[PDB]
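Students often ask why we bother predicting the structure of a whole assembly rather than each chain alone. The short answer is interfaces. A chain on its own may look different once its partners are present, and contacts between molecules only exist in the joint model. In this exercise we take two input lines together and write out one structure for the complete complex. Read the inputs first and try to guess which parts will touch.
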Amino acid sequence: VPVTGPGEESPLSCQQSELWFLNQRAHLGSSYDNVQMAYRVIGPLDRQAYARAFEGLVARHAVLRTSYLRRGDTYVQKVNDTTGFAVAFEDVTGDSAVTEFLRAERPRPFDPADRHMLRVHILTLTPYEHVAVVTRPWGIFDGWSTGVFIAELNALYQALSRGDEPSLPELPVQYADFAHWQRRTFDADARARQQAYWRAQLADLPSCTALRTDYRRPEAKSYQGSSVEVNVPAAVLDQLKRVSKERGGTLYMTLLSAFATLLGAHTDDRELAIGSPVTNRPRPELERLVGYFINVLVMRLDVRPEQAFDDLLAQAQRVTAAAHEHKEVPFADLVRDLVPEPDPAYSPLFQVMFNLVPAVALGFVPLPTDSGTAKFDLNLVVRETPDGLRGYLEYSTDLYARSTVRSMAATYERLLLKIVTQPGASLARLREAAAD
Amino acid sequence: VPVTGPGEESPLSCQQSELWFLNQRAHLGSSYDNVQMAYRVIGPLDRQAYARAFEGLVARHAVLRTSYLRRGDTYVQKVNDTTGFAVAFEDVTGDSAVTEFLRAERPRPFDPADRHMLRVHILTLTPYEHVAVVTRPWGIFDGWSTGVFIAELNALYQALSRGDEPSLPELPVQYADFAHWQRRTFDADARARQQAYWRAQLADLPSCTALRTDYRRPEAKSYQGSSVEVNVPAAVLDQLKRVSKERGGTLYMTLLSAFATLLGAHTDDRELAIGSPVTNRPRPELERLVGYFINVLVMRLDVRPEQAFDDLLAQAQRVTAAAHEHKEVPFADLVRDLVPEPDPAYSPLFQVMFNLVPAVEADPGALGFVPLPTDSGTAKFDLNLVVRETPDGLRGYLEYSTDLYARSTVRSMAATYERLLLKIVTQPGASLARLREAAADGGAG
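Now the answer. The structure tokens for the assembled complex follow.
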């Protein structure tokens, strides 16, 4: 319900506890974590109409035009009018020039006091070829919001180029209203209950995972990394979705179990802590908004090699269900409460992350950009697509070489198929089968 | 003379005003400016002997073992012992893996209160090939100190490889003794005089150059950049030296004049502010130390197109001669005095830098060295020409900000510079405009 008026300051969210400037690193830089999205537009493009489409898209969503102010010991979010935003134009010749311009564009600092958290550039190569550049800092909005952003941009441009009136569904509630609703629902009791549950669940947990690396762990993390591509065919993904249904779980649980089985071949521990970002949209009005609804949970999973993968999958389902009940407490609070002094050589409470994002005339070709960053030792971000299962494995170059991570992705691809074919075997047998 | 005892606190020298923790940037990080020196050691290397040679350097050179501790609103240098230093050994298979390892290791932080201010990695590739990574923060030692460091490393390694003992010339003084002398060798008057000279010399100057760029200038500098190669034949260098000695100047003056003439084709200002780093080692004792002895001086040149090149050469001689007499006050102090509020769009007090690196001065089973190209993709200035003298001619690169320039424009600028040098060689008394239009015969790139 609307509980926000003009000139009123709203608090933050549980998922807004790690935007980009609440996780500052001294040796890395404030803007090392910016998110840049670039597209190539093909065909006769009404450039002014496309700029107006971006203007209207910014004016439609209030997260793209919200500021952050320091009120004593805490911060508040304020909504600004779309006045001031403008799409910048530049004539660029060649692909290498575009790449160099993008590399120069991404690390430009964003400020908490910025009126707009977005930077839009249209690069004019030819009268028929253009490049659209979208840049934001970390913690602004997630992949769901990105798909909504792109779809609404395309619709509004199509409705505005040929002099028509744009027609898009009205957004029922604002993000600030959602934060206000969560504040009054989650004040002091459920927070304490979830914190106690995570304290008891994550008890007697090692501070770090004894994962074997190619290079010695430095006394301080550099957070420089790369990524390698992982691809799963559509038939294997369909078979995974089928085998997940028979066990009463979802595809995310099966894929997380596969990731846990992958990591047991490089560690001697029996308990693996795998972080995982999960969507928290507990209302019908939130499936359409643009914003950050993602929170991080640690999956404490027993990885004894002698247990059959069915038992592992059931244990993973139970752990996810128990964590899905306690997904409201921010991960930063858990880290600061359970690790008072973080060792600068590794990431707190887990060193491996798994992510699964749900499935989402001019021609559009996305421009891949490698940020060259790694917040964890490993990070799996996989996507659901009509032609299969596509994603990347983000690794740290302090500890790992490229070849080992590529082999890890390949054996993960083999492991998914081996799980599909023979789910009745144990983890040791599964890894032995996937060794070849 | 040595006036320092063990475990005694010492003040900071003038060239130490720019190490890393007094020139931090919020969005760049603490370790964006780390100087990674990497080179390939080819042939049979005694890896443990090489590590012992680096340790002997750390023991010999107290700068590589000095800590920096805050005492109030300043910093002091305390010379720790040689205990603690060790060489990290890693096994790397592949040059792309080496490049990724270098990119990851370079931004690893250094602490002001560390016991040793260098990281040495002997990346093992094959039994007869190695990569020696000497990563240090900015301001630890400079190019001349880099040459001294490399020569002493070679001497120590050649002494320790076989069953011999180290035999190196004894160092009469230490950098702490140099700092004590430098703080003694003024009565609060030299700083005032040099500050007054530099504030009077740069007065009535634009806060930024009106140079033409391919792209519009962003609100904040991204500090990303690239470079293009500059190459000059040996004969052209010899003729340039002949012209310089005929006119009563040096090679640096002629190259700076040529650089200023090149920049006139891309601007409408009648004056140019060009920054340049210079060596300050005013003692025979300091000529073989390891340390930081570089200050940055800015050269102001008039580039009106109706004047002959000889007038520009004379003006360059005058300004360079006057600059070397006032090369003690740090450039950071000049920036603080003359620039109250810096603009994040451009570098302060100058956006073009010209650098002339001083020149650097046989067993069957010796080792070969190949300096790995360390292009960090950083740019502190809009344009940065860095050249050095070699027996094969003149070598260097032209560093440009990627926020403003495409590669083709800077490549055309480099070609125009190399053509203008030859035009100057073959035409002594031409005019600036005539030289520019003669050097423009590049066929539009």
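Check your guess against this: The first strand of chain B starts at residue 9 and ends at 10.
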